């Protein structure tokens, strides 16, 4: 239920995925990047 | 015409040569700027109506 009202898409992507294990992320949101 | 179709343009390189040359069109001319010269600008979005 989390993805539902999909309503007014501007961009949408598909890649390939990722992964006692640790995943480390940095997410940053700069000069609209 | 009253229902008429819009597709969003994102996020792609646009070829627009191939657009020009096909020449099976019969309405083509441009507002806003040339036509030969759109080939070269970059844009948010297009919309497609």
Do not use: H, M
């Amino acid at each position: 239920g989390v993805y539902s009202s999909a309503n007014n898409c501007t961009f949408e992507y598909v890649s390939q995925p990722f992964l006692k294990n640790l995943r480390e992320f940095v997410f940053k949101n700069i000069d609209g990047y | 015409v009253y229902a008429w179709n819009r597709k969003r343009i994102s996020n792609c390189v646009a070829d627009y040569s191939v657009l020009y040359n096909s020449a099976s069109f019969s309405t083509f001319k441009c507002y806003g700027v040339s036509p030969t010269k759109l080939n070269d600008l970059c844009f948010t979005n297009v919309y497609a109506d």
